Amino acid sequence: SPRLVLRALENMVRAAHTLAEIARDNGNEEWLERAARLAEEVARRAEELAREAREKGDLELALKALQILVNAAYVLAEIARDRGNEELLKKAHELARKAAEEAQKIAEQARYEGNLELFNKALRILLEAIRVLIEHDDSEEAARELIRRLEELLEQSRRS
Amino acid sequence: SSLEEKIEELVKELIKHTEELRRLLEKLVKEGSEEYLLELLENLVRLARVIAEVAREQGNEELLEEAARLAEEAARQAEELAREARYEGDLELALKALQILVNAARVLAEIARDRGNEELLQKAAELAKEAARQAEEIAKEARERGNFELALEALEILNEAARVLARIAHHRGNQELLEEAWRLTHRSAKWSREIAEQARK
Amino acid sequence: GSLELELQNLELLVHIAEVLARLARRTGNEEALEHAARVAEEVAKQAEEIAREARYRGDLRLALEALRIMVEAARVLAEIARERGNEELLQKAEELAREALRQVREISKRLQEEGNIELALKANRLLIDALEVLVRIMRHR
Incomplete structure (x- = not known):
């Protein structure tokens, strides 16, 4: 049941966020590595x-x-x-860029077939992945490329 | 001052509006x-x-x-x-x-x-601890009955309660509570992974 | 739903504008920042027109969803x-x-008079969320 796996992964990434907070609050370093391990496992799954x-x-x-x-x-x-x-x-940025690349492929197919409902859902994932790359970016060179990607995202949604 | 007085008047109006909805549901x-x-x-x-x-x-x-x-x-x-x-x-x-x-x-x-x-x-x-104890009980009950969707919903509430119990442990001086909230969060993640693995097979 | 899909696109539009305005202001791109400000303004205007059109039809559920986008x-x-x-x-x-906030209050009173409790609960939830937004707006001035 893919829907069951989906829901289990949502619980797992929320727990990893909580584990990181408990580890950072206590200042426990081995605990924080255990939280990052769970977040990495959720990304793989x-x-x-x-x-x-x-593929299906x-x-x-x-x-x-x-x-x-x-x-x-995130x-x-x-x-x-x-x-x-x-x-x-960099590994966290690579996971967000991968999620954006996969959502871009879904967004293109939905736009090609006129599936505006799916198209809006894929552009939303594209925006969420960009937020991760923008979150504490402070790389002005990357901020210029992200501005262009956001501007193109603006025109893609307005043209539909 | 006067801006604060306008904000207090707005909040007082929302309270009276919500209490009217409470009165409607009560009747x-x-x-x-x-x-x-x-x-x-x-x-x-x-x-x-x-x-x-x-x-x-x-x-x-x-x-x-x-x-x-x-x-x-x-x-x-x-x-x-x-x-x-x-x-x-x-x-x-x-x-x-x-x-x-x-x-x-x-x-x-x-x-x-x-x-x-x-x-x-x-x-x-005490509220968060009671909700966590019931959520875990319900998670074990639903898991035993094969209701994985209900078990996963209970494990999310378990993590939400442990997330609140942990912030209290860091705000106050308790360190044992930060360990208990850590065990509940691990249990929520552990049982969720088990359900995910069973849903693949 | 045509208007329901229109509201979905408007919410995505204003959330792209929010991220774009945040980044454009951080790098000093006045044109991208002004562009993001115009889109957020147009989304609020279009959301209000859809809410008013939904209120004309008597579709108060659609009106509450449009007003939620307006508040956002x-x-x-x-x-x-x-900033x-x-x-x-x-x-x-x-x-x-x-x-x-005024339109949600009017709709909430009409729903309570009709005994429509499901929609009245949604309207009250948006009423709370709308006041939180308004109070925050009044405070950073």
Whole structure:
């Protein structure tokens, strides 16, 4: 039951966010690594769920799994920011960019077939993935490219 | 000042409007029910959150106490409806009442953090602990009965209650509570992964 | 639903504008920031027209969903104006939130008179959320 896996992954990424808060509040470092481990596991499971859904044709399910992937990248990015770990932050950015790339493919098919309901859902995932890359970006070169992507996202939604 | 007086007048109007809806639902028990009572309690918790946020900036002690009393009554009712729903075999409705219980306990712990009140803080922890104990009981019951969707819904409430119990442990001086909230969060994630693995096979 | 799909696109539009305005202001792109401000303003205007059209039809559920988008567009508009010290845009956002609050109050009273409790609960929830937005708008001025 993909719907059961979806719901279980939502609980898992929410627990990983809570585990990171409890670890950061207590200042426990081994606890924080245990929270980042769970967020990474959710990202792996969410990508595999979205890929299997995309390979089967259930694109609404794939988009919901990509939202979990984005949320897992958000938890990993916050852990990287609080710990000042650039290697983890790049991995968190790569997960969000992957979620954006998968949502872009779904968005194009929905636009091609005139499926505006699915098209709006895929553009929403695209925006959520960009927010992760924007969250504490402060890389002015990347902010210019993200502005262009947001402007193109504006015209894609307004043209539909 | 006068802007604060306008904000207090707006919040007082929303209170009177919401109390009118409460009066309307109260007069609807004369002919009959459950799902719309829980939704009204959810609105009361949301209203209490907005009231306390307004009172915190204006230094309004009377409005802050009115927000707390509104959250305790919502928590009292939600705990009663959850107990009746379990008695009547409506576990879906019981979990919906437990979520209101956690939400009311969150705003009550925040008021107890903004306004120094040890009795209100221990009250908020007792609510969240009761909701966590029931959510885990319901999760084990639904898991044993093969109701994985209901079990997953209970494990989300379990994590929400443990998330509140942990913030209380960091705000106050308790360290053992931060360990118990950590075990409940691990249990929510562990049992959820098991359900995910069973749903793949 | 045509209008329901229109409301879905408007909510996405104002959320793109919120993120764009946040980033454009951080890098000093006045054109992208002004563009995001115009879109958030147009979304609030289009959401109000859909709410009024839904109120004409008697579709109060659709009207409440349109007014929810109106409140969200007013919140996004007010945050842009606060970051810029733009008094005119902040007053435009406050008047949009005030207008949405008034329409939700009128709909909530009509639903309570009709005994429509399900929709009255949704209207009361939006009434609480709309006042939180309005109060926040009045406070960062």
